């Protein structure tokens, strides 16, 4: 309808090796345009665009403000990591795995073997297809990693193949929730 | 980076709408319901592991709105450019007849954070058990949003996620049908 005006604020805390290395960023946006920001690596505000120059100047002259911002990596970032660590960083949900035939064309018959991996967390995962014990790579297609928006992920890794009597297929799933690769076999 | 926690808030005019939420590696930990001044955790169990004073988010929004007033003036009132969403509809897991599942409508890469979303079954609106998330952040500073609809798979039911955005020339619909 009418013209809209959007103001955005993001306070970011980036962690490397737990809280050993932490980086704080306070970023101000206007209509998708970041104009000014504080980066703990610099210790003061820096304009990102023309609009932010006068802002950076005014804020930077207030040392008491800069001191408080310089302490966020500790009293904000590390502090919050400590609080949510147990149910976020350490959260682990085993994946459910199923293998089933599918068609790349409702016309003919099944010529696609789908390895479905769902309900897992974190998102980091590895899926490999094996035919008669040998990894297959050229005919693999996937939906890629899919986020469900509810602290779970899923992915479909499909093998383009025409099953023949006697063949044995194997889907192998590697994920942080388990200390050994999970496998599901399918026999034609 | 092994992990990232983002506190994201925004205010929009003339809609006068604002949101405050915490994101962890792409997922939402909680958001604040402005009107109720209550902390809404994404997963029920979280409220037993931590706490957040919702009152603080209201104070933050007040500041963000004040900054919007000033920056709208200093930027000579240049309006935000509409960016149309990309919609995807998929199920929570492989579908099986008569086995409870969930349809998910994933709206991504759009701005401003305003959209009309409707779940349609066989062409008729459905609201039974439908839920949704607030507007989630992206690294490119656009927005993401999820809509859910628990359903009972059948070869007799067709579904569509109808999405409306000011950057879209016409209502966008995504179809889904059981694969028999």
């Amino acid at each position: 309808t009418r013209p809209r005006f959007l103001e955005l604020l993001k306070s970011e805390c980036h962690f490397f090796n737990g809280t050993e290395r932490v980086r704080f960023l306070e970023r101000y946006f206007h209509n998708q345009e970041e104009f000014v920001r504080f980066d703990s690596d610099v210790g003061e505000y820096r304009a990102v665009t023309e609009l932010g120059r006068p802002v950076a100047e005014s804020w930077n002259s207030q040392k008491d403000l800069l001191e408080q911002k310089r302490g966020q990596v500790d009293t904000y970032c590390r502090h919050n990591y400590g609080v949510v660590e147990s149910f976020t960083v350490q959260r682990r949900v085993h994946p459910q795995v199923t293998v089933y035939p599918a068609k790349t064309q409702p016309l003919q018959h099944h010529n696609l073997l789908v390895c479905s991996v769902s309900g897992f967390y974190p998102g980091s995962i590895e899926v490999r297809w094996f035919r008669n014990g040998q990894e297959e790579k050229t005919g693999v297609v996937s939906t890629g990693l899919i986020h469900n928006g509810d602290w779970t992920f899923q992915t479909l890794v499909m093998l383009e193949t025409v099953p023949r009597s006697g063949e044995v297929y194997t889907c192998q799933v590697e994920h942080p929730s388990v200390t050994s690769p999970l496998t599901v076999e399918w026999r034609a | 980076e092994e992990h990232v926690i983002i506190q994201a808030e925004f205010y929009l005019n003339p809609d006068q709408s604002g949101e405050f939420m915490f994101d962890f590696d792409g997922d939402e930990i909680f958001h604040v319901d402005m009107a109720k001044k209550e902390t809404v955790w994404r997963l029920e169990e979280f409220g037993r592991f931590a706490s957040f004073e919702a009152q603080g988010a209201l104070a933050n929004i007040a500041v963000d709105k004040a900054n919007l007033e000033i920056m709208t003036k200093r930027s000579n009132y240049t309006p935000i450019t509409n960016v149309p969403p990309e919609v995807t509809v998929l199920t929570n897991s492989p579908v099986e007849l008569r086995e409870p599942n969930v349809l998910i409508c994933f709206i991504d890469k759009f701005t401003p954070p305003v959209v009309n979303v409707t779940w349609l079954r066989n062409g008729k609106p459905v609201t039974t058990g439908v839920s949704e998330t607030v507007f989630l952040p992206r690294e490119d500073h656009l927005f993401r949003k999820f809509h859910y609809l628990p359903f009972l798979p059948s070869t007799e039911d067709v579904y569509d996620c109808r999405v409306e955005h000011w950057g879209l020339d016409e209502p966008l619909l995504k179809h889904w049908e059981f694969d028999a």
Partner: peptide, 22 residues
Amino acid sequence: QHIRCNIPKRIGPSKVATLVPR
């Protein structure tokens, strides 16, 4: 057990709200 929020800075002292352009 308490999550802290980061507080943004006001760009200016103006407490005026104006109806955005039509």
